[PDB]
Design an enzyme around this catalytic site. Structure first.
Site, PDB file in Angstrom:
ATOM      1  N   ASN A   7       0.904  -1.132   0.000  1.00 22.23           N
ATOM      2  CA  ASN A   7       0.000   0.000   0.000  1.00 22.23           C
ATOM      3  C   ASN A   7       0.968   1.214   0.000  1.00 22.23           C
ATOM      4  O   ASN A   7       1.711   1.453   0.964  1.00 22.23           O
ATOM      5  CB  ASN A   7      -0.949  -0.005   1.208  1.00 22.23           C
ATOM      6  N   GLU A  36      -3.979   1.688  -3.082  1.00 23.23           N
ATOM      7  CA  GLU A  36      -4.084   3.128  -2.822  1.00 23.23           C
ATOM      8  C   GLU A  36      -3.161   3.911  -3.759  1.00 23.23           C
ATOM      9  O   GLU A  36      -2.324   4.701  -3.317  1.00 23.23           O
ATOM     10  CB  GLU A  36      -3.796   3.427  -1.328  1.00 23.23           C
ATOM     11  N   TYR A 106      -7.674  -3.893  -2.101  1.00 21.67           N
ATOM     12  CA  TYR A 106      -7.530  -2.783  -1.173  1.00 21.67           C
ATOM     13  C   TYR A 106      -8.903  -2.736  -0.466  1.00 21.67           C
ATOM     14  O   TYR A 106      -9.876  -2.251  -1.030  1.00 21.67           O
ATOM     15  CB  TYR A 106      -7.161  -1.462  -1.886  1.00 21.67           C
ATOM     16  N   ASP A 145      -3.903  -4.827   1.268  1.00 20.57           N
ATOM     17  CA  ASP A 145      -4.191  -4.158   2.513  1.00 20.57           C
ATOM     18  C   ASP A 145      -5.610  -4.547   2.820  1.00 20.57           C
ATOM     19  O   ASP A 145      -6.545  -4.074   2.170  1.00 20.57           O
ATOM     20  CB  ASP A 145      -4.039  -2.648   2.340  1.00 20.57           C
ATOM     21  N   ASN A 147      -7.018  -4.127   5.778  1.00 18.95           N
ATOM     22  CA  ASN A 147      -7.562  -3.244   6.823  1.00 18.95           C
ATOM     23  C   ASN A 147      -8.059  -4.017   8.028  1.00 18.95           C
ATOM     24  O   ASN A 147      -9.168  -3.780   8.536  1.00 18.95           O
ATOM     25  CB  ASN A 147      -8.659  -2.340   6.256  1.00 18.95           C
ATOM     26  N   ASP A 242       3.315   4.875   4.577  1.00 25.51           N
ATOM     27  CA  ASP A 242       3.039   4.564   5.986  1.00 25.51           C
ATOM     28  C   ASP A 242       3.060   3.036   6.202  1.00 25.51           C
ATOM     29  O   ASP A 242       3.304   2.575   7.315  1.00 25.51           O
ATOM     30  CB  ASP A 242       1.753   5.249   6.505  1.00 25.51           C
TER      31      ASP A 242
HETATM   32 CA   LIG Z   1      -3.563   5.778   3.074  1.00 29.48          CA
END
Ligand SMILES: [Ca+2]
Ligand SMILES: [Ca+2]
Ligand SMILES: [Ca+2]
Length: 252
Positions: A7, A36, A106, A145, A147, A242
């Site tokens: 990501n 993303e 994602y 990702d 989440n 990140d």
């Molecule tokens: Ca982000």
């Protein structure tokens, strides 16, 4: 084969912070999946030599989006799942090879205070059903990702996040249902009890340095591919986003 998932928190942002083209050359992976990308058209120049590139864009600008880079040309590429409500955000790309499907996801975020958990639960059900349809044809390698930090070992501070997006009982249970359907979390297959292994940290000063992270990036494989996993890893040294990349070495 070598697969990487990352990501990037925006393709334009990652490319401003690190030499992305040099990174791809260094790793020389067979497949690289990005989440993303935050791009449309016609926004960035990413035509690397050695890779067939597939893009999925969200209808809304500077938001979501995915990409798959593959050395080998797939038999087919499928964008989204064929449900209008789940196909507006450029979240899913599926590549069909002779003996396997390789897909990137994602996952929609449940948002602050789990205000959009209802959609996340409908998303989890629809995606699982779609993955199960693929799996009936050929084994599946999914990355992205997701989440969700599955277990308490998947984040630094589980007790401070029971009611926060990424660690609600509802999100953890949906990931459990996915594995119970006949799927394996590749990193946990290699490292079932390893603590402090994370793929995301806040950008806040000191958070990444102190390893205050979460493992929310995965390579999930059909149970039949379990024995084919050579290595599963988290590339924590890679800067630019990140999140850091996650990787898989698998024989297929
Ligand atoms: Ca982000
Ligand atoms: Ca063959
Ligand atoms: Ca512990």
């Amino acid at each position: 084969m070598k697969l990487i998932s990352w990501n990037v928190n925006g393709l334009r942002a990652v490319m401003r912070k690190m030499d992305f083209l040099s990174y791809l050359k260094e790793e020389d992976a067979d497949i690289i999946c990005l989440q993303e990308t935050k791009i449309q058209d016609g926004q960035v120049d990413l035509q690397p030599e050695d890779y067939h590139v597939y893009w999925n864009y969200a209808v809304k600008k500077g938001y979501s989006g995915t990409a798959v880079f593959s050395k080998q040309e797939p038999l087919q590429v499928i964008y989204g799942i064929g449900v209008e409500e789940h196909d507006q955000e450029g979240r899913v790309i599926t590549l069909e090879f002779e003996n396997v499907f390789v897909m990137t996801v994602y996952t929609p975020n449940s948002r602050r205070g789990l205000e959009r958990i209802d959609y996340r639960m409908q998303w989890e059900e629809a995606l699982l059903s779609y993955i199960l349809e693929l799996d009936q044809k050929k084994p599946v390698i999914l990355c992205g990702d997701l989440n969700v930090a599955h277990q308490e070992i998947d984040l630094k501070n589980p007790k401070a996040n029971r009611n926060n997006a990424g660690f609600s009982d509802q999100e953890r249970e949906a990931f459990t249902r996915f594995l119970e359907a006949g799927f394996v979390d590749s990193f946990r297959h290699v490292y079932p009890d390893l603590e402090g292994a994370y793929s995301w940290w806040s950008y806040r000063a000191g958070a990444r340095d102190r390893n205050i992270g979460w493992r929310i990036d995965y390579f999930v494989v059909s149970e039949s591919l379990k024995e084919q996993i050579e290595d599963a890893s988290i590339s924590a040294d890679v800067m630019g986003s990140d999140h850091c990349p996650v990787e898989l070495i698998i024989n297929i």
